[PDB]
Structures are given as structure tokens and as C-alpha cells.
From a paper:
A tetratricopeptide repeat (TPR) motif containing mitochondrial outer membrane protein, mitochondrial fission protein 1 (Fis1), mediates mitochondrial fission by recruiting large cytosolic GTPase, Drp1, to the mitochondrial outer membrane. The cytosolic domain of Fis1 is composed of 6 tight α-helices with two anti-parallel TPR motifs forming a concave hydrophobic surface. Fis1 interaction with Drp1 occurs during cellular stress, but not under physiological conditions, suggesting that cellular signals during stress activate Fis1. Human Fis1 protein contains a single cysteine, Cys41, in the entire protein.
To explore this possibility further, we crystallized and determined the X-ray structures of the WT and three phosphorylation mimic-mutants of Fis1: Thr34Asp Fis1, Thr34Glu Fis1 and Tyr38Glu Fis1. Each of these mutants was previously shown to be sufficient to increase Drp1 recruitment to mitochondria and subsequent mitochondrial fission in cell-based studies. Consistently, we observed that the first 30 residues including the α1 helix were missing from the structure providing strong evidence that the α1 helix undergoes significant conformational change and is potentially disordered in the phosphorylated forms, whereas it was intact in the WT. In one of the instances, Tyr38Glu Fis1 mutant was crystallized in an intermediate state, where the α1-helix was still intact, but was shifted away from the rest of the protein, as compared to the WT. We crystallized the phosphorylation-mimic mutants, Thr34Asp, Thr34Glu and Tyr38Glu Fis1, and we observed that in all the cases, these mutants crystallized as covalent dimers mediated by Cys41 disulfide bridge between two Fis1 protomers. As Thr34Asp, Thr34Glu and Tyr38Glu Fis1 have a greater propensity for a conformationally altered N-terminus and hence have more exposed Cys41, they crystallized as covalent dimers. Upon closer examination of the crystal structures, we observed that the concave hydrophobic surface in the covalent dimers of all the phosphorylation-mimic mutants was exposed. Here we showed that Cys41 is also oxidizable and mediates Fis1 covalent dimerization through disulfide linkage. This oxidation-induced Fis1 dimerization was obvious in the crystal structures of Thr34Asp, Thr34Glu and Tyr38Glu Fis1, where we saw a clear electron density for the disulfide linkage.
Residue numbers in the entry:
A (entry chain B): 30 to 127
B (entry chain A): 31 to 127
The structure:
């Protein structure tokens, strides 16, 4: 039932090797998001970006991390994650058309 | 701006067209992190409404139940929950709204 239980569970799933676990972790984070404080929602949003990045949902991950940067332009984790997204995207495009 | 995106999402989620409702859902979900608390109230309610109308019952239920956690006496939310519960039992024509 608990909110910490869901977030701790989702933290593990988003860190997981298996894509099914990452998807479920995102599903938990999406449900937690409307229930969080403004600061928790910032954390939730960063972890939603990470999860979608690992699932190769690069456009969704980029949308989450761009939103974080609208309001926190000095956030270095978000800048770094955006850099990583850009780089995976460029390599994935190459793979598509080879 | 936030107000005009919500004004567009408000129209979309109430539209007669399924395409519109989908896009309204997209827009409310982006607004969700950006809103004050008395703003997220409306965002969460209209996400539940939109998902309900597209027969995304599990999503709609998650949204309204969270709203009922914060506002146990909210009779519009409770009514929308009653509607979701009923649509989940058998595929049919969703009630007027």
C-alpha cells in the first residue's frame, strides 16, 4: 500500500537488467507522480527519464528531462542524462539506416 | 503557458473524437509535474476522465483513487469511480457525461 514501498520497489525495477522489470518500474513511478510533493515529483521525473532511456524510449526520456531542465537549468544530473540520451539516439539512428 | 495548455487539454478530454481525447491525455500528463497542488487536482481528475472515456479503466482507476486518497469526500471523484467500476464488469456503452 505504502508510498515509500512503491518508490523503493520502483527504484529497484528501474535499475534492473530485464526490460520487463524496467517497464513495471515506470508504471509504478507514473502512478506515484500525481501523489508526490513538488520535490518528490522532481525525483520521480528523473527516474522516469532514466527508465525510458534504458527502454530506448528516447523521445519520452528526452521529454521528461527537458521538463526538469525548464525549471532546474543548473541541474547537473539532468544535463548529464540529456547528454547520454542524445548520444544513444545518434548511434541508434545510425543503426537504423545501415 | 500553463493556463492555455490546460485550456486546450480541457477541450480535448471532453471532445467527441477519440483522437482528441488521446492528445488531451498526453498534454495533461506533461502539465502534471508543472502544476501547483490545486492545479494537479484538476489535472488528475481530467486524466481519469479521459482514460475512462477511452476504456483505459486501470489507468482511470489509479488516477481517481489517488484523488480519493487526498479528498475522501470528493463526490465527483467518487462518482467517476463508481462509473469505472461498472464499465469494468462488462464491455458496453459508457454512461453519459
Amino acid at each position: 500500500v505504502s508510498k515509500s514501498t512503491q518508490f523503493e520497489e520502483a527504484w529497484c525495477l528501474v535499475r534492473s537488467k530485464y526490460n520487463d522489470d524496467i517497464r513495471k518500474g515506470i508504471v509504478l513511478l507514473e502512478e506515484l507522480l500525481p501523489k508526490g510533493s513538488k520535490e518528490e515529483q522532481r525525483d520521480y521525473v528523473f527516474y522516469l527519464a532514466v527508465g525510458n532511456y534504458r527502454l530506448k524510449e528516447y523521445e519520452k526520456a528526452l521529454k521528461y528531462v527537458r521538463g526538469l531542465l525548464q525549471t532546474e537549468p543548473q541541474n547537473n544530473q539532468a544535463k548529464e542524462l540529456e547528454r547520454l540520451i542524445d548520444k544513444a539516439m545518434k548511434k541508434d539512428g545510425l543503426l537504423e539506416v545501415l
